[PDB]
Amino acid sequence: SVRKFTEKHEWVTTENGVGTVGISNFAQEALGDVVYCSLPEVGTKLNKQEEFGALESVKAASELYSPLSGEVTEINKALAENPGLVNKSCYEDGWLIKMTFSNPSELDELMSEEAYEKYIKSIEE
């Protein structure tokens, strides 16, 4: 019952068969100020690894890939008017989507926060 990460610098938290997905601090730094969030429709089916949207900044687009197989249940409506929540609160108020997840074994494939710490330390050295 802890946050896990992807090698593309996304995160997911889980409770009750529902995952909440966002981007890590490393990811939001790499983008700079987010100007637009392209998010999926509620009810969209996703496979793990499937594209679900994109973030835009002056610097780049960043394509979003699902960390889990399942079905979108919520998108963060605050990001239409306040996309910069992704930078100011990437783990909390700047969450992107929530989804039910159909294959719990998939979490075992993701990175623990300890592994993600080691990952970004090695990248940044």
Residue numbers in the entry: 1 to 125
What text appears in the publication on this structure?
The bovine H-protein is a monomeric protein of molecular weight ∼14 kDa that plays a central role in the glycine cleavage system. The lipoic acid prosthetic group, covalently bound to Lys59 of the H-protein, interacts with specific sites on the P-, T- and L-proteins. The gene for bovine H-protein was isolated from a bovine liver cDNA library, and the purified recombinant apo H-protein can be lipoylated and activated in vitro by lipoyltransferase, using lipoyl-AMP as the lipoyl donor.
In this study, we applied the high-pressure cryocooling method to crystals of bovine H-protein, and determined the X-ray crystal structure at 0.86 Å resolution. The high-pressure cryocooled crystal of bovine H-protein belonged to space group C2 with unit-cell dimensions of a = 84.73, b = 41.40, c = 43.28 Å, β = 91.57°. The differences in unit-cell dimensions were less than 0.5%, even though the crystals of bovine H-protein had a high solvent content of ∼55%. The interactions and the positions of water molecules for crystal packing were perfectly conserved between high- and ambient-pressure crystals. The final model consists of 1172 protein atoms, 300 water molecules and two glycerol molecules. Hydrogen atoms were observed as peaks in a hydrogen-omit electron density map calculated at 0.86 Å resolution, and 48.9% of the hydrogen atoms could be visualized. Multiple conformations were observed for 31 residues, and 23 residues shared multiple conformations with the ambient-pressure structure. The r.m.s. deviation for Cα atoms is 0.12 Å, and the r.m.s. deviation for all atoms was 0.61 Å.
